[PDB]
């Protein structure tokens, strides 16, 4: 799945967690091409952790990059 | 059920649009995926009709455009292009792209993708147009961005189409590379990586590919852009080492040392580090594998910035990515004072044992006892690796007797439902058998049977 499904997966798996608006999914996904469908999910769950790891109750676009770099390496 | 749904659709469209036309498309599409080639029919009464539905400024409720498009995307490639061009003349596309209809755009986008000569529209403006919609920060519709991208990657094979890209748009590209605007910029980067694959030495302007030492530092202000670039370069060096394009090294050899510094300097540029640390290590692991003389460029980056060894927090990281040859020579003391056979080091073991010389530095840490201590799941991973090279196999086949057996008989090797363990184990046998009966002394019989029992079930 590369027709930017990665983008959708995020949008979908996101509307089930505390995440602020914005967060250009088109880009955040361009950082995870070879990421098999399941990988996208593993990033989201981690993203929320950084927000908690810090303090905020909502995840910002930057928390995702901090996760993608920690996940997809 | 091919030609059945073929006309079942074409006719349901000329009607008043039944409330199941969305379902008819849904399934009739999968039937196309199966059968490769199409019958001896005329695709004019269909495409010339769907085009009317997509170009129609009027939409319909009982019609899921997403499906209707999936049908077109899988039809244009099958049927001959000469017939397709008859429904979509060279001029039709130009309009389809300039229209205010997204569903219509994505259509022509894939029609251009399957253009017969990959250098047909090479003398048109349609190519410049797509590039204009791609780097158009406004366009958010993904279904279009990709449709166009995948269309370029297929045509960028021809020599002519590339000229229309890096000669008839060279100024526009350099332009977007100048505005460096998150959305627009990123789209250009992923694009360049794709073009560098079908490009030669001459047709290579370092005014659109290579980045000035300044540009990098100026992107750090928008991490998202910085990370996207570090990966771009990492892939750029990758593409070079695999396709033996050692000519490009002369270019992307001035900025590489820049990243090393940004990585080390945490005081200033705190973001870079704990915000892209990993994606960076991915590059340093590629620079170490660069075709140079006596590892010149890297030898310095290490001695200057990436002081491998100094930082323990990274020791493991280093020995898991950085070239094993370079490691066993300029950092032999490291690979010798830390790599310990375990499910944990299972990572290092894979990269370290990549060079016979390097391996001969860790082979003193190996022993059947330390290997059989860790659970089967990890054993197979370690064993399978020791069988990915010849110098390692000889070791496992001799100095390591016990282990070899812990791979074959146990009473019922089939009692392994763990898909992962099965993978590695079954693999550790595949390459272990290629060794030939000659080498595989008394383990050939048990192997050829244990593997055979696994290959079947």
From Swiss-Prot, chain A:
Protein family per UniProt: Belongs to the AAA ATPase family.
The stretch of the full-length protein covered here is 381 to 452 of 467
Q: Where in the cell is it found?
A: Cytoplasm; Nucleus
Name assigned to this protein: 26S proteasome regulatory subunit 7 homolog
The upper taxonomy is: Eukaryota, Fungi, Dikarya, Ascomycota, Saccharomycotina
**What is this protein's function per UniProt?**
The 26S proteasome is involved in the ATP-dependent degradation of ubiquitinated proteins. The regulatory (or ATPase) complex confers ATP dependency and substrate specificity to the 26S complex.
- What interactions and quaternary structure are annotated? Interacts with UBR1 and CIC1.
Q: Posttranslational modification, per the record?
A: The N-terminus is blocked.
Annotated gene: RPT1
Other comment: Present with 105 molecules/cell in log phase SD medium.
Swiss-Prot record, chain B:
Does Cell membrane show up as a keyword for this record? no
Recite the UniProt keywords alphabetically: Chaperone, Cytoplasm, DNA damage, DNA repair
Record bears the keyword Chaperone: yes
Secretion signal span = none
**Entry's localization field:** Cytoplasm
**Chief location category:** cytoplasm
What are the GO BP annotations of this UniProt entry?
mismatch repair; proteasome regulatory particle assembly
Short name of any one Pfam family annotated for the protein:
HSM3_N
SUPFAM superfamilies linked to this entry: ARM repeat (SSF48371)
- Molecular function per GO: protein folding chaperone
GO cellular component term of the entry, any: nucleus
Q: Which function does this protein serve?
A: Involved in DNA mismatch repair in slow-growing cells. Acts as a chaperone during the assembly of the 26S proteasome, specifically of the base subcomplex of the 19S regulatory complex (RC).
Miscellaneous notes: Present with 468 molecules/cell in log phase SD medium.
Q: Which protein family is it in? A: Belongs to the proteasome subunit S5B/HSM3 family.
Task: Summarize subunit and interaction data from the UniProt record for this chain.
Answer: Interacts with RPT1, RPT2, RPT3, RPT5, RPT6, RPN1 and RPN2. Part of transient complex (BP1) containing HSM3, RPT1, RPT2 and RPT5 formed during the assembly of the 26S proteasome.
- Tell me the protein's name: DNA mismatch repair protein HSM3
């Amino acid at each position: 799945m590369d027709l930017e499904g990665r983008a959708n997966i995020f949008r979908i798996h996101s509307k089930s967690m505390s995440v602020e608006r914005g967060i250009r999914w088109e880009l955040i996904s361009r950082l995870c091409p070879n990421s098999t469908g399941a990988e996208l999910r593993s990033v989201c769950t981690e993203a929320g952790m950084f927000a908690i790891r810090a303090r905020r109750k909502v995840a910002t676009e930057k928390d995702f990059l901090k996760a993608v770099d920690k996940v997809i390496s | 059920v091919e030609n059945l749904l073929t006309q079942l659709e074409n006719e349901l469209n000329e009607d008043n649009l039944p409330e199941d036309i969305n379902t008819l498309l849904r399934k009739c599409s999968l039937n196309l995926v199966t059968v490769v080639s199409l019958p001896d029919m005329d695709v004019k009464p269909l495409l010339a009709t769907i085009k009317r539905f997509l170009t129609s400024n009027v939409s319909y409720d009982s019609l899921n455009y997403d499906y209707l498009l999936d049908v077109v995307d899988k039809l244009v490639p099958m049927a001959d292009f000469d017939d397709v061009l008859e429904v979509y003349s060279a001029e039709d596309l130009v309009k389809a792209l300039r229209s205010e209809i997204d569903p219509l755009k994505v259509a022509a986008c894939r029609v251009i993708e399957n253009s017969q000569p990959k250098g047909l529209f090479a003398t048109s403006n349609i190519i410049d147009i797509l590039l204009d919609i791609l780097f158009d920060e406004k366009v958010e519709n993904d279904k279009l961005i990709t449709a166009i991208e995948k269309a370029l990657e297929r045509l960028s094979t021809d020599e002519l189409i590339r000229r229309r890209l890096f000669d008839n748009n060279l100024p526009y590209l350099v332009s977007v590379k100048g505005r460096m605007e998150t959305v627009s910029f990123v789209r250009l980067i992923d694009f360049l990586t794709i073009e560098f694959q079908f490009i030669s030495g001459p047709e290579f302007k370092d005014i659109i590919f290579c980045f000035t030492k300044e540009e990098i530092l100026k992107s750090v202000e928008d991490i998202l852009v910085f990370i996207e670039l570090v990966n771009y370069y990492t892939k750029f060096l990758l593409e070079i080492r695999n396709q033996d394009k050692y000519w490009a090294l002369r270019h992307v050899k001035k900025i590489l040392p820049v990243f090393a510094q940004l990585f080390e300097d945490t005081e200033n540029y705190p973001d870079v580090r704990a915000f892209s640390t990993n994606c960076l290590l991915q590059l340093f692991a590629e620079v170490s594998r660069i075709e140079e003389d006596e590892y010149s460029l890297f030898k310095t980056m290490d001695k200057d910035s990436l002081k491998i060894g100094s930082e323990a927090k990274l020791i493991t990281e280093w020995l898991e990515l950085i070239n094993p040859q370079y490691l066993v020579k300029y950092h032999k003391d490291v690979v010798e004072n830390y790599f310990h056979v375990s499910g944990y080091s299972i990572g290092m073991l894979r990269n370290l044992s990549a060079d016979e010389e390097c391996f001969n530095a860790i082979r003193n840490k190996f022993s059947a006892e330390i290997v059989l201590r860790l659970p089967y799941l990890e054993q197979m991973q370690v064993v399978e690796t020791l069988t990915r090279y010849e110098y390692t196999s000889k070791f496992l086949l001799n100095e390591m007797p016990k282990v070899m057996g812990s791979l074959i008989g146990d009473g019922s090797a089939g009692a392994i439902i763990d898909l992962e363990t099965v993978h590695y184990r079954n693999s550790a046998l595949r390459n272990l058998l290629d060794k030939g009966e000659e080498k595989l002394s008394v383990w050939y019989e048990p192997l050829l049977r244990e593997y055979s029992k696994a290959v079947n079930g």
